[PDB]
Amino acid sequence: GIVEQCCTSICSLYQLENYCN
Amino acid sequence: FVNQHLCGSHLVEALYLVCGERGFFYTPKA
């Protein structure tokens, strides 16, 4: 999930936008 | 800003700024 991709590892804009509505 | 380790309120604020009026969903326990 998002915590694995952005918190435990380095986040990116590409990944963050996967969670916008 | 975006390219770093973002956790908790720090991650939530990034989603807020990036998604804008589109909104977003936060699911820690995916």
The residue ranges of every structural domain in chain B are 1-30
Name the structure determination technique.
X-ray
Residues B23, A20: contact at Cβ < 8 Å?
Answer: yes
- Three-point CA angle B2, B5, B10, nearest 5°: 70
Query: Three-state SS across A5-16?
Result: HHCCCCCCHHHH
- Three-point CA angle A6, A9, A15, nearest 5°: 35
**A15 lies within 8 A of chain B by CB:** no
CB spacing of B19 vs A20 below 8 angstroms: yes
